Design a protein around this ligand. Structure first.
Ligand SMILES: [Zn+2]
Ligand SMILES: [Zn+2]
Ligand SMILES: [Zn+2]
Ligand SMILES: [Zn+2]
Ligand SMILES: [Zn+2]
Lengths: 32, 387, 293, 445, 196, 356
């Protein structure tokens, strides 16, 4: 189970951010 | 349900579930084949090595000396974790791993005591493997073919390596160790659980294998299904009539019905549609009006009744008269089940006020018909036999 | 949603209609079927502009594809009707005249075995051809059989007919069968309809046949899942014995050849593959039920 | 929306006029084909039987699964008035239109047809050499005029008048030119079938006083006619219409006999690839197309640079995109054209990209994007640039004596949806020019 | 280094030893391991007891790995004197005889793998010096050595071996060997007629 | 020449098909499908990996097997960690085996294979099988080595004594023990050990195993098996099923005990009687009277008609005549029908049409 957990953590470490998943043009512009 | 309260013999219950018993037995009754366990053990300051009970058992089987030391020391002096930590640091593990022992480094004082004992086991194992060999691959006879052969002795490249002092460097010992390990593994396979002529022959030069499959010719003949012929003159006249009608002209507008058979046709078509629609409207278990508590009880009574029916037929159609008494016992059990089925209907009838009794009876109609039919056949055959 | 191919199989034989007309009071009922089919085929061609039509007639000495006519004209229908309908109807009737002329010449020939099975197999081959040639077309088989005429033996027809069912089930080609005659049930054809999501219809009177075709046999493959079929009869999927000719609910089958047998064959030898059964093994079946003494 | 557009037009026709439209079987045969498959099944049942069937019997035919379709079919069938609902004896009896019923029966049974399908002279001609070229060129000539590419011959005033009077190809005399509109680009995107219906559908609405029924008797009858055949001579209104149809590349005339064309049959039902192109990150275009249609349409929003016999190469530029956008073409339409006309190689790699995306993480199903995402974003970003400056027309209200009045007038504008901006602190708000008069009237009252 | 641990996972390791009886038992174990599918690897000496009569037809031999040219110990007084005698008497060059002596042993081991024509095996000569000894190999072996295989890498050798083993596992077409590689009685008569 | 190249190659492909005789085959089969799930199956020679492709093809094989063998039974075994793991008992339900195979698809294969463990498990699973059934074992072996606890040769001798038949599909190369197992267990025949050469050949190998294997002349087990044909009944209210004990709308009624069963073909849960429809028997008749192959007609002679007898496909005139005739009825057929008449249908329309 630990190795499976480590593999899951390894996959998470490699996952790209959310903003890369979808084109964030329609959403409100970044800022404070 | 079928053994505790019903009273069905335990032996009879397992007669129809042999494959389930056999499958479960073989799952725990099988063992993995032999393999070089110590080769997989890599030490990998701190070094972390992981062990498992399966490997621990494998080490004992592949090496009796380890079991000899393990059995007499773990309960006496120190706990098992120290032992395996002690064993690995010892030179015995290095020697058993087929690695040259170094006088520079010493391992465990306790384990090294068994080094001389291993030298005794190896000699005992050498005789355990020594046996006459076929002359085909008898390498001893090749060198003994000429007992008086005397030429030029081979150079040092053709002889085992030696040190400055002239004694063996010890690299040959590990070669024998791996050779012994392989020989033991193969011998372990051949446990309690003419030929030369065939091998020397060249198979490719022999006649090719010929298939010996059987041919079948199927004759075809059978009787017709079991629960006024026009003459040639009539055919010609009738054939002439259709030709004249067709050649002259073809009528299409006459196909319209008279409106009297169309209504009958529509009623007949809708008559079938309603029957099909009724069946098609109700053609994971389906939702049931019965309460969960009652439904679960009905399934229990259905399952137990079916189990009794299954056993009854096996003995009824067995063909051996030695099981007549068992049939009577099962027949009595079937009678009790019928009473239990009737009692449940009465209990549901009064408890639910006939609201669920009609629904409950339908759910058990097919089994009830089978049960009463089974008893009828038993009685009918019993009547003829006895009287 | 997609075009569908209709392959009508018509079983025309001089013996079949001669008995039908003699027992009944309908003369030239074959024309009634043909004209009703012409309208039905025109109706099918009107349901969609991309649907084709295939007609196969099982005559005395074989089968022939009435439509489409082979590459190898009289006025039998009015020329004022629709061009596309006429282009199919005029050729259909013209080939009918040729087909009757050939049959009349060989009237004396003794045709003992019907060719209904052959036509269905030929139509399936045509269905396979058309399906693969154009790629995105459905299919549907319609059998117009006159069962009034007494048949000699349908035993041999069992294997070819049941085999066509599996092929139709592989290509998703529902086959519908309409029988006009005396017997209400046809154990083989009825199984064909049920086993292929088809419809079986039995009608005594030929008049008003178009109503049957337009309401019952007009169900296209596109809307089968949403329409309840009008079939009324229930099939049992049974087979006759090999030496008694009666339907068997429980019986014996030879393992080697898989031939049904109501009782133990005489001589302890199979009558189909000449296979001898072990006396001890058969004795097990012969054993009577166990009863207390 | 092929049948929907045609069906929608038929619904607006008065029931009295719809009855006349069903007199000719030729039209009935086409109106029968346009209905859903389930609807067609019921129509064929009622046509040949002279009886009344309750609606409940119809419901029995449909399975529970297809109940929803039975609602659309009955609603669509009832909307056209083809299905007449009669209620008597406490039952809602259902019957078909007698004229439609009679018309269908005559055609199917081969009865008298009143020459709805025409006649035959047996003077067949070669279609591929002349008919295909003539109509394709004639249909291409109007497209080149629509696309704006130069071409010597211009379409006749009859169609030209229709185009300007229609939303298609907006024109201005002051500009002195013709340009495509948002719907115009959609028109070019629609398949040939719908591409022909749109112009015809506009023609149906354009015509005024030529009877409305006569025009439908001709257009529907045209589909019945078969290409490569002769037909003698027809209604008086149809004669000028026949000449009018000759301008649309639908019917070919030698100068007594008129010959339909391939497009005539294409109107009834439907029927490496040419036009497929590759898009790179460098905004380059490589179209594996040899045809003026693909080249002409691509030039709308692409700056072509060179061409070969088998392919055409170009580069997307801000100027070309700006020129296309200035004409009213939305970026969504542009990407739709590229996505639906993508080369198989792009689709295969795009499928691999989706497979790779799912292979690494099969939890999510990302959209299958054939072209690189950057191009879509940049094209959308260029659209945002055009929409940067936003300006309205109207009047500004200020100098309010009391806040209550300011809130009352401002609230009133919001209710009627003519308020564009307000500020409580300054007691000022702005309203659209359209709502100026309404606000002023409310202020007085 | 740890190479053996990896080899042990796939096949049993048997090694030739100076003792004759121990070596004979190893052959018995090696043959038993190959017959039962366990798989075994035998390490021997080209100039040893195994190479002088032990056969590995079919299963007991499927690949021959010649680790280097079995060159004799050149710095040997007995050998050096022998070379001088041949050079002076039989006019045989020292290098030619040494290469001939080494090759006669390398080829000796190569021929102990094929019995009949249904037998197959891959022979690899692992030494940079074998690249120029193709002309010295036996004719029936040299003919089978292609010009592309004269100098291969380990990775390239594995790919070819895998392809060859896969190809040899297919059912041979009888017609391809009816009378071109195997002769029946009728074919033999035909050959005696054409020759005569 | 390119088209002619296909014809000459087609003739060579037809050369093997010329020799067809009605050999006796065992229709009643009891197959035990064994799969290898070891470290050696993690390679990428088959995309994505051997384990994935083998499982995918196994699902297809199950569908085809039960399609053409309705009255047979199947059992699934896998090799893992040097042990044989049972995942599906012998049963006639195609869905249960498919569901079990789907679950196996998730877990990663590891460990070494053990033929003896798999063979011993298969030996026990086939013990409770009637003598009229043909006991067969299909093994998908990928490893080049086998680790077993006992002597494999003893197991091979036992298998022969039990009249079991073993077919092995290899991935890389021939294993001596596998060849002996497939040869000693098939009365000396050497054609039951197949090694694939590519992905495409594997599909054919799986498809070949669907058809029943011919029986040997000296192996006689002829007997009569008691079967029953239940009558389908339609009920207004759901009732408990005798096989799964759950509420179902309707089920077939056994003619010997009237007990209801959800689906066929299955052994009756009460009288242990096999319930099969007449159609199921009809699915195997083509193996007893196979349709004779068609022989192409030389272009030298004159042909009968320009259009195909069965599909009305105009014969391409163009060299070699694209026509094949049936010896029994002597009717020309196009190339297309012959493939469809020998793969989909099994009856020649020309022979049926001819009256007698
Ligand atoms: Zn038999
Ligand atoms: Zn059930
Ligand atoms: Zn039963
Ligand atoms: Zn054909
Ligand atoms: Zn034939």
């Amino acid at each position: 189970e630990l190795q499976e957990r480590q593999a899951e953590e390894k996959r998470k470490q490699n996952a790209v951010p959310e903003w890369h998943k979808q084109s964030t043009i329609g959403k409100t512009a970044l800022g404070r | 349900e079928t053994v505790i309260n019903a009273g069905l013999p335990p032996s009879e219950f397992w007669s129809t579930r042999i494959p389930l018993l056999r499958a479960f037995a073989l799952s725990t009754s099988q063992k993995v084949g032999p393999y070089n366990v110590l080769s997989t053990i890599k030490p990998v300051n701190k070094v972390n090595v992981n062990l498992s009970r399966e490997k621990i058992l494998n080490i004992f089987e592949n090496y009796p000396i380890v079991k000899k030391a393990y059995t007499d020391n773990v309960p006496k002096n120190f706990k098992e974790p120290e032992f395996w930590a002690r064993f690995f640091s010892s030179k015995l593990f290095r020697k058993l791993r087929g690695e040259k022992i170094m006088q520079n480094d010493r391992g465990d004082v306790i384990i090294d005591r068994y080094l001389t004992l291993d030298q005794e086991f190896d000699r005992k194992d050498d005789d355990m493997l020594l046996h006459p060999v076929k002359k085909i691959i008898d390498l001893d006879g090749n060198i003994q073919d000429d007992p008086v052969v005397r030429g030029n002795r081979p150079d040092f490249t053709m002889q085992p390596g030696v040190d400055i002092n002239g004694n063996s460097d010890g690299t040959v010992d590990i070669l024998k160790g791996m050779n012994r390990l392989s020989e033991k593994m193969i011998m372990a396979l051949k446990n309690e659980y003419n030929d030369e002529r065939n091998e020397l022959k060249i198979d490719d030069l022999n006649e090719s294998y010929k298939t010996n499959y059987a041919i079948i010719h199927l004759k075809r003949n059978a009787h017709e299904k079991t629960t006024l012929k026009v003459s040639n003159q009539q055919m010609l006249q009738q054939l002439s009539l259709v030709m004249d009608n067709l050649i002259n002209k073809l009528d299409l507008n006459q196909v319209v019905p008279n409106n009297e058979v169309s209504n009958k046709i529509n009623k007949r078509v809708i008559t079938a549609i309603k029957i099909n629609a009724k069946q098609a409207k109700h053609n994971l278990e389906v939702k049931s009006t019965l309460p969960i508590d009652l439904l679960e009880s009905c399934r229990m009574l259905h399952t137990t009744c079916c189990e009794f029916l299954k056993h009854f037929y096996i003995h009824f159609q067995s063909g051996e008269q030695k099981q007549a008494s068992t049939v009577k016992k099962l027949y009595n059990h079937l009678k009790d089940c019928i009473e239990k089925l009737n009692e449940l209907f009465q209990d549901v009838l009064n408890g639910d006020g006939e609201s669920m009794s009609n629904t409950c009876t339908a759910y058990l109609k097919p089994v009830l018909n089978s049960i009463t039919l089974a008893t009828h056949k038993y009685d009918e055959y019993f009547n003829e036999y006895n009287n | 949603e997609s075009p569908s191919l209709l392959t009508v199989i018509i079983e025309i034989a001089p013996k079949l209609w001669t008995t039908f007309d003699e027992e009944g009071n309908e003369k030239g009922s074959i024309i009634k079927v043909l004209e009703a089919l012409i309208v039905f085929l025109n109706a099918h061609l009107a349901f969609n502009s991309a649907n084709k039509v295939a007609v196969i007639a099982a005559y005395s000495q074989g089968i022939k594809y009435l439509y489409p006519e082979s590459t190898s004209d009289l006025k039998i229908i009015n020329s004022d009707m629709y061009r596309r309908f006429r282009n199919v109807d005029e050729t259909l009737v013209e080939e009918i005249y040729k087909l009757f002329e050939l049959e009349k010449k060989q009237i004396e020939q003794n045709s003992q075995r019907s060719t209904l099975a052959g036509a269905m197999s030929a139509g399936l081959t045509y269905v396979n051809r058309i399906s693969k040639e154009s790629v995105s077309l459905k299919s549907r088989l319609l059998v117009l059989t006159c069962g009034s005429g007494s048949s000699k033996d349908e035993i041999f027809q069992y294997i070819p007919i049941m085999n066509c069912i599996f092929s139709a089930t592989k290509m998703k080609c529902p086959i519908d069968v309409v029988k006009i005659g005396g017997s209400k049930e046809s154990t083989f054809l009825q199984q064909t309809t049920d086993a292929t999501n088809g419809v079986y219809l039995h009608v005594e009177s030929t008049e008003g046949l178009i109503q049957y075709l337009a309401t019952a046999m007009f169900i296209d493959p596109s809307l089968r899942p949403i329409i309840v079929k009008p079939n009324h009869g229930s099939v049992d999927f049974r087979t006759s014995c090999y030496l008694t000719g009666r339907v068997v609910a429980v019986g014996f089958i030879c393992s080697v050849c898989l031939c049904v047998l109501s009782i133990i064959p005489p001589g302890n030898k199979c009558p189909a593959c000449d296979s001898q059964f072990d006396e001890h093994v058969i004795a097990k079946l012969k054993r009577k039920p166990v009863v207390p003494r | 929306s092929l049948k929907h557009s045609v069906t929608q037009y038929l619904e607006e026709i008065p029931q009295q006029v719809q009855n006349r439209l069903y007199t000719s079987p030729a039209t009935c045969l086409a109106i029968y084909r346009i209905l859903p498959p389930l609807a067609k099944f019921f129509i064929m049942a009622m046509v040949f039987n002279e009886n009344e069937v309750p609606l409940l019997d119809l419901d029995k035919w449909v399975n529970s699964n297809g109940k929803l379709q039975f609602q659309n079919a009955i609603k669509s069938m009832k909307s056209l008035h083809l299905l007449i609902p009669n209620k008597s004896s406490g039952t809602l009896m259902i019957n078909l239109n007698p004229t439609f019923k009679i018309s269908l029966r005559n055609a199917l049974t081969g009865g008298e047809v009143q020459n709805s399908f025409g006649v035959v002279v047996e003077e067949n001609v070669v279609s591929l050499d002349l008919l295909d070229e003539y109509s394709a060129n004639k249909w291409e000539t109007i497209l080149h005029f629509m696309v704006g590419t130069p071409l010597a011959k211009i379409p006749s005033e009859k169609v030209l008048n229709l185009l300007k009077h229609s939303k298609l190809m907006e024109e201005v005399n002051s500009t002195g030119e013709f340009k495509i509109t948002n719907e115009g680009f959609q028109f070019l995107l629609q398949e040939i079938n719908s591409q022909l219906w749109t112009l015809l559908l506009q023609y149906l609405k354009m015509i005024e006083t030529m009877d409305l029924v006569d025009v439908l008797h001709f257009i529907f009858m045209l589909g019945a006619l078969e290409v490569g055949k002769a037909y003698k001579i027809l209604s008086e209104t149809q004669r000028i219409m026949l000449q009018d149809m000759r301008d649309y590349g639908l019917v070919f005339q030698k100068h007594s006999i008129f010959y339909p064309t391939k497009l005539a049959l294409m109107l009834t039902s439907d029927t490496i690839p040419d036009g497929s192109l590759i898009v790179e990150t460098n905004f380059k275009i490589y179209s594996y197309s040899n045809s003026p249609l693909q080249i002409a349409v691509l030039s709308l929003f692409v700056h072509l640079k060179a061409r070969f016999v088998n392919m055409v190469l170009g580069q997307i530029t801000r100027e070309s995109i700006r020129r296309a956008l200035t004409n009213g073409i939305t970026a969504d339409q542009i990407i739709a054209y590229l996505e639906t006309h993508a080369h198989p190689q792009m689709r295969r790699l795009a499928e691999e990209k989706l497979e790779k995306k799912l292979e690494l993480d099969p939890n999510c199903k990302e959209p299958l994007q054939v072209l690189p995402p950057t191009v879509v974003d940049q094209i959308r970003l260029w659209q945002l640039e055009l929409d940067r400056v936003i300006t309205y027309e109207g009047s500004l209200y200020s100098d309010f004596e009391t806040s209550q009045e300011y809130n009352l007038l401002s609230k009133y504008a919001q209710d009627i949806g003519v308020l564009l901006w307000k500020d409580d602190k300054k007691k000022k708000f702005f309203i659209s020019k359209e709502g100026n008069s309404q606000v002023l009237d409310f202020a007085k009252r | 280094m740890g190479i053996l641990d990896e080899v042990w996972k796939h096949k049993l390791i048997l090694v030739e030893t100076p003792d004759a009886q121990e070596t004979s038992l190893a052959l018995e174990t090696y043959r038993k391991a190959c017959s039962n599918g366990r798989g075994a690897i035998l390490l021997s000496v080209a100039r040893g007891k195994v190479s002088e009569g032990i056969d590995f037809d079919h299963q007991y031999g499927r690949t021959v790995l010649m680790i280097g040219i079995p060159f004799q110990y050149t710095e040997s007084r007995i050998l050096k004197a022998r070379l001088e005698f041949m050079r002076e008497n039989y006019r045989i060059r020292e290098n030619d005889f040494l290469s001939f002596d080494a090759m006669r042993h390398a080829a000796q081991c190569l021929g102990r793998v094929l019995r009949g024509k249904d037998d197959y095996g891959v022979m690899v000569l692992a030494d940079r010096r074998f690249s120029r000894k193709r002309s010295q190999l036996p004719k029936w072996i040299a003919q089978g050595l292609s010009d592309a295989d004269l100098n291969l890498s380990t990775d390239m050798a594995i790919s070819n071996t895998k392809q060859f083993l896969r190809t040899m596992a297919q059912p041979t077409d009888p017609k391809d060997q009816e009378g071109v590689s195997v002769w029946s009685y009728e074919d033999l008569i035909k050959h005696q007629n054409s020759r005569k | 020449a390119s088209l002619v190249a296909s014809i000459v190659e087609a003739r060579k492909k037809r050369t093997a098909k010329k020799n067809i005789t009605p050999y006796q085959r065992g229709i009643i089969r009891s197959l035990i499908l064994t799969l290898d799930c070891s470290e050696a199956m993690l390679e990428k020679d088959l995309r994505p990996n051997r384990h994935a492709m083998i499982i995918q093809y196994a699902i297809d094989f199950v569908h085809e097997f039960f399609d053409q063998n309705p009255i047979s039974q199947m059992g699934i075994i896998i090799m893992r960690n040097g042990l044989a793991q049972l995942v599906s008992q012998v049963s006639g339900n195609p869905q249960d085996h498919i569901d079990a195979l789907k679950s196996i698809r998730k877990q990663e294969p590891k460990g070494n294979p053990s033929l003896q463990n798999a063979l011993e498990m298969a030996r026990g699973l086939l013990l409770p099988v009637p003598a009229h059934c043909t006991r067969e074992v299909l093994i998908v072996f990928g490893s080049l080595s086998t680790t077993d606890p006992g002597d494999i040769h003893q197991t091979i001798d036992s298998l022969v004594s039990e009249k079991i038949r073993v077919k092995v599909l290899g991935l890389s190369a021939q294993v001596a023990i596998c060849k002996e197992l497939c040869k000693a267990t098939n009365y000396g025949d050497e054609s039951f050990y197949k090694i694939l050469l590519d992905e495409t050949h594997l599909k054919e190998l799986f498809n070949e195993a669907v058809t029943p294997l011919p029986v040997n002349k000296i192996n006689k087990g002829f007997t009569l098996v008691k079967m029953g044909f239940p009558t389908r009944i339609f009920e207004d209210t759901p009732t408990f099923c005798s096989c799964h004990s759950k509420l179902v709308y309707g089920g077939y009624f056994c003619p010997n005990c009237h007990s209801k069963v959800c689906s066929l073909p299955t052994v009756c849960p009460c009288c242990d009687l096999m319930l099969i429809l007449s159609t199921h028997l009809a699915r195997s008749y083509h193996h007893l009277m196979p349709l004779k192959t068609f022989a192409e007609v030389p272009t030298t002679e004159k042909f009968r008609s320009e259009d195909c007898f069965s599909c009305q496909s105009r014969f391409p005139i163009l060299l070699t005549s694209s026509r094949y005739r049936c010896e029994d009825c002597k009717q020309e057929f196009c190339v297309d029908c012959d493939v469809f008449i020998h793969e989909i249908l099994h009856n020649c329309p020309g022979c049926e049409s001819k009256p007698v």
